[PDB]
Amino acid sequence: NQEDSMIMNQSSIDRGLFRSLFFRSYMDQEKKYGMSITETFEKPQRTNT
Amino acid sequence: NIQVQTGYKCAVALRDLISPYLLRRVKADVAKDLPQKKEMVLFCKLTKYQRSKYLEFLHSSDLNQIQNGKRNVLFGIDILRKICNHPDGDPKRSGKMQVVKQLLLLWHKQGYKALLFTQSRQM
């Protein structure tokens, strides 16, 4: 508990003390820079891509 | 405030100097056996598909901010024609392809020989 270290109660931690949720988002879109050139979301394959 | 006739008059001043130096044989006394040189212009209208897309290019490309005389700007000049020449794309999506179709099938039964006239290998 020296040099800013701490000693904690593991069983209290086990009980859920200070747990938190984490969220993250993603986003995208199709046809970008090209006239009538539409990129697309579609399940790929090494022989298909 | 300036008239065409003035510009023309200047052209006249130069043009009409070349009288004794201009030689010209004409077919008025040669073309003794040929048909009438007939011509006309077809009036094909754009489909919903075509009309929407050539306008969409103009609306979404923003050529004037790209600046003018640039590749996609200039391509636009051809692209707006390609909406009926290509588009990439069954002929049912092109009024021109449908006009050609109808004229050739007519002439198919007429038994007429016919030329197609196009200035491009891609085309």
UniProtKB/Swiss-Prot annotation, chain A:
It is found in: Nucleus. Mg(2+) binds at residue 4. Coiled coil: none annotated. DNA-dependent RNA polymerase catalyzes the transcription of DNA into RNA using the four ribonucleoside triphosphates as substrates. Second largest component of RNA polymerases II which synthesizes mRNA precursors and many functional non-coding RNAs. Proposed to contribute to the polymerase catalytic activity and forms the polymerase active center together with the largest subunit. Pol II is the central component of the basal RNA polymerase II transcription machinery. The binding of ribonucleoside triphosphate to the RNA polymerase II transcribing complex probably involves a two-step mechanism. The initial binding seems to occur at the entry (E) site and involves a magnesium ion coordinated by three conserved aspartate residues of the two largest RNA Pol II subunits. Belongs to the RNA polymerase beta chain family. Component of the RNA polymerase II (Pol II) complex consisting of 12 subunits. This is DNA-directed RNA polymerase II subunit RPB2. It comes from Saccharomyces cerevisiae (strain ATCC 204508 / S288c) (Baker's yeast). The chain holds residues 834 to 882 of 1224 of the full protein.
Swiss-Prot record, chain B:
This is DNA repair and recombination protein RAD26. Belongs to the SNF2/RAD54 helicase family. The gene is RAD26. It is found in: Nucleus. May be involved in the preferential repair of active genes. The chain holds residues 544 to 679 of 1085 of the full protein. It comes from the Eukaryota.
